[PDB]
Design a protein around this ligand. Structure first.
Ligand SMILES: Nc1ncnc2c1nc(-c1ccccc1)n2[C@H]1C[C@H](O)[C@@H](COP(=O)(O)OP(=O)(O)OC[C@H]2O[C@@H](O)[C@@H](O)[C@@H]2O)O1
Ligand SMILES: Nc1ncnc2c1nc(-c1ccccc1)n2[C@H]1C[C@H](O)[C@@H](COP(=O)(O)OP(=O)(O)OC[C@H]2O[C@@H](O)[C@@H](O)[C@@H]2O)O1
Lengths: 465, 284, 19, 88
């Protein structure tokens, strides 16, 4: 049952690889995840990871429930690094039952635990849930139970157990590392239809990490290694690039699935992700004050390109990792200056969620301002951008935005241009958009044609009598 | 609506310190002997001015002007000498040569507001060390145990039956000061064997002044910090130095305790542990 | 009235490059 | 106060149970991100059930105290020995 396309990187690690740097007992020697080539291979040479890491059918693919934390089943799967993005997308949709998302919400930041102001908590974890409740979106978190990826899990917990509504299920996809997950043992069973349980132990872990409790689905990537951290990055960007290219069809109008990044406190690796996201043309949002790299960007966001005041402004990394601001490194500071300049240079692709000036509007509204600004700034050959924005607004089911942003602007439009959107709204039963289009002037006596009726009657409610 | 208007009626009414401190208390561990107030500015007499007068008090137990069981005295008695080594009492200072201006010594780190030694059995700076033994806080396997990203230590501390705190095994050199580097508390608490051999090659954390609550204006405790650290999980030495625990002082509890900024240790012990937890990148 | 008091509870929280 | 690890949080919860101040017990010692397991609330859950404070029952159920696991045989036996003495 589809245990043959999803493979996992496994190979003996102590063929010949010592160092020794992490002596402990050995480099994951016999009676460990290393089990296949325990007899004598040819030489071993230098490990040099083209010493063939076997891709055999996966042994960790099932349904996981947390023993004494929650009681709802959760799906997971062990995935190799070289797995094509299309295979994972097919697995997530066709066999996990997930509907095609209307929006991707990438949540990045720092793994280290932290706290913010209670007002910021109460606004962020109340807006992030509502961004998804209305839209039917996906939340690609960081996986495990520490930091930004733990706070989003807390946000989902603050909803799915207080206002436990089946209508509008929260879909959070956890992408983490196999080899970093702590208790992956007792979770390996090559016939995986089992509802095994996870002992959520945060105390036992050393240089490892446990999975977060509140996550609808889990995706684990590995190279057959132990303790490595930078392995899930080049399968998250690759997956997101493909999901963004994938398209939705629905009733009458077809859209291109958008994507957004939501940052928080982050280290050197969050800044690089922010840079790589904006280069590909994906808008990102920064909150007004919680964290090392986020707050630097928030403060330098309206200034023109005149920088390297960063030597002073980087004090917000209060712990001063590598022991102070002048002694991070001259090379790393001069590298971060270029990155900050690059981020600030794309005005359209970047927005900052200034607390006092934008939270009263909402966080929801700014998190949809990012996508609309990106679509407006995209090159479109004339008029295509407005209709694409309307198509997105139909799927958002956000009539307030669809009005206040793409009908309060004075672009040229004829009432006939709304007919393909009018049909989609009628099929999807959104009377609020019907009212908006009638206010803007869609004359039904002219809109309702013979072919329009014929098409409408082929899209009745299948559950109707 | 009635509960929200109440939420609105209430909404519209909105229109350097580095001198020794633990020694400048108001009281002293025993008897009234209340000290003389000395604000922060007036602690160093080197560049400050008088108009103070401390309440002279000495030796607290037997004979203020004799203290024969404790050995010395200066009661217009030249006799004593505050330099080099002398007889069994070092009387030196790890902060340079201090001042014998008024005939009696003076604690260089500031004027803490009294005249005679309380309990310290010598007007000269008493010498003591606190060897802390630390292990890497193993969990059920090697692993280590990081708090957030930094590693965690485990020190050995002892709680005396009547004492209301925990203390690193310390002491003060008993019959003699040139005699074993094998402090009295550990001797009473451990069957002395090769802890000396282990300590002699230990790393020196903090040579300096201890902010004891028993400094008056003289007879001030300075200390040296030796920190032997154990790396492996069992070792002949860890298993031996766990099996060599006799103690048996009717309630004296020696349990391995994790390091943090919330240990019930004395303040000076806590700051010494802070100093010792920076050489190895510990958590604290 | 209930929809307008909600509109008021939220209203009172407002306190070279050429290279 | 010095507390040796985790004792301070449970002492604060014990105080909050007696305060009968659910707003403080929430906003101060549950809005802070300390580590806690739902099993750790069982001794406090029993005290709240005995003292008839449904507001704390709701708070602990929100935080995730699963009754199906909390209600043990010994817990029932202890609960039935602390009925309301004025009850029929
Ligand atoms: N899953 C993870 N991945 C990467 N390091 C992780 C991690 N869990 C932990 C972790 C382990 C024990 C306890 C608490 C936390 N650590 C550690 C090791 C690292 O040296 C350090 C720097 O902290 P950082 O804040 O400097 O981190 P980055 O800025 O590089 O990005 C963070 C990632 O989260 C994603 O959403 C992406 O955004 C980005 O890959 O924490
Ligand atoms: N505030 C404080 N700070 C640092 N240590 C302190 C302390 N209060 C006490 C204390 C404990 C029980 C009864 C009375 C007093 N102590 C301990 C430490 C040591 O064992 C001895 C004096 O230190 P010492 O080792 O220099 O002299 P000894 O008492 O061994 O002869 O009491």
């Amino acid at each position: 049952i589809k245990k043959k396309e999803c493979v996992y990187f496994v190979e003996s690690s102590k063929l010949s690889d010592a160092g020794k740097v992490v002596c402990q007992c050995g480099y994951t020697h016999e009676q460990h995840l290393e089990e296949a080539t325990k007899p004598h291979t040819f030489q071993g040479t230098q490990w040099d990871p083209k010493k063939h890491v076997q891709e055999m059918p996966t042994d960790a693919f099932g349904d996981i429930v947390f023993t004494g934390l929650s009681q709802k089943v959760k799906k997971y799967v062990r995935v190799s690094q070289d797995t094509p993005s299309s295979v994972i997308y097919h697995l997530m949709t066709q066999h996990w039952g997930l509907d095609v998302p209307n929006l991707l919400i990438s949540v990045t930041g720092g793994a280290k635990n932290f706290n913010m102001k209670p007002r910021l908590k109460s606004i962020f974890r109340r807006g992030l849930v509502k961004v998804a409740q209305t839209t039917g979106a996906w939340i690609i978190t960081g996986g495990s139970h520490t930091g930004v990826m733990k706070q989003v899990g807390e946000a989902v917990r603050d909803f799915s157990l207080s206002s436990s509504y089946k209508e509008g299920e929260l879909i959070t996809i956890g992408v983490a590392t196999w080899g970093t997950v702590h208790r992956r043992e007792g979770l390996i069973h090559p016939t995986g239809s089992f509802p095994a349980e996870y002992i959520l132990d945060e105390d036992g872990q050393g240089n490892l990490t446990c999975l977060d409790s509140n996550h609808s689905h889990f995706i684990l990537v590995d190279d057959g290694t132990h303790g490595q951290y930078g392995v899930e990055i080049p399968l998250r960007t690759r997956l997101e690039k493909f999901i963004s290219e994938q398209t939705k069809e629905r009733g009458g109008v077809a859209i291109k699935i958008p994507i957004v990044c939501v940052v928080l406190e982050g280290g050197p690796g969050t800044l690089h992700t922010i840079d790589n996201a904006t280069t590909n043309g994906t808008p990102c949002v920064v909150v007004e004050g919680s964290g090392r790299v986020a707050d630097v960007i928030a403060q330098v966001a309206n200034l023109p390109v005149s920088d390297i005041t960063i030597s002073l402004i980087q004090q917000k990394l209060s712990v001063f990792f590598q022991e102070m601001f002048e002694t991070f490194t001259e090379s790393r500071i001069v590298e971060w200056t270029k990155k900050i300049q690059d981020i600030v240079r794309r005005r359209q692709l970047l927005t900052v969620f200034r607390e006092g000036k934008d939270g009263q509007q909402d966080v929801d509204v700014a998190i949809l301002q990012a996508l609309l600004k990106a679509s407006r700034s995209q090159d479109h050959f004339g008029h295509e951008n407005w209709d694409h924005q309307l198509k997105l607004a139909v799927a958002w089911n956000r009539v307030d935005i669809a009005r206040s942003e793409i009908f309060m602007d004075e672009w040229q439009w004829k009432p006939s241009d709304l007919h393909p959107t009018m049909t989609a709204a009628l099929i999807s039963n959104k009377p609020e958009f019907v009212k908006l289009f009638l206010e803007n002037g869609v004359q039904l006596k002219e809109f309702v044609t013979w072919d329009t009726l014929l098409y409408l009657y082929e899209n009745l409610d299948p559950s109707c009598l | 609506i009635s509960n929200k208007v109440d939420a609105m009626v209430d909404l519209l009414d909105l229109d350097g310190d580095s001198y020794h401190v633990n020694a400048r208390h108001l009281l002293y561990p025993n008897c009234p002997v209340t000290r003389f107030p000395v604000p922060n500015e007036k602690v160093p007499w080197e560049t400050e001015f008088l108009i103070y007068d401390p309440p002279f008090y000495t030796a607290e137990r037997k004979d203020a002007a004799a203290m024969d069981p404790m050995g010395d005295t200066l009661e217009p008695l030249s006799t004593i000498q505050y330099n080099v080594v002398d007889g069994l009492r070092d009387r030196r200072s790890f902060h340079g040569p201090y001042t014998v201006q008024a005939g009696l010594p003076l604690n260089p780190m500031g004027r803490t507001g009294l005249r005679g030694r309380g309990s310290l059995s010598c007007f000269g700076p008493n010498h003591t060390l606190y060897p802390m033994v630390t292990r890497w806080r193993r969990n059920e396997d090697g692993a280590i145990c990081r708090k957030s990203i930094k590693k965690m230590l485990e020190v050995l501390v002892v709680k005396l039956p009547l004492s209301e705190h925990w203390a690193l095994p310390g002491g003060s050199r008993e019959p003699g000061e040139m005699l074993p580097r094998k402090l009295k508390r550990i001797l009473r608490q451990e069957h002395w064997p090769s802890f000396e051999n282990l300590l002699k090659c230990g790393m020196e954390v903090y040579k300096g002044y201890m902010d004891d609550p028993r400094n008056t204006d003289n007879a001030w405790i300075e200390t040296v910090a030796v920190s032997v650290h154990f790396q492996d999980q069992n070792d002949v030495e860890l298993n031996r130095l766990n099996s060599n625990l006799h103690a048996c002082d009717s309630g004296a509890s020696i349990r391995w305790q994790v390091v943090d900024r919330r240990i019930p240790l004395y303040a000076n012990h806590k700051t010494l542990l802070q100093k010792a937890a920076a050489e190895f990148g510990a958590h604290y």
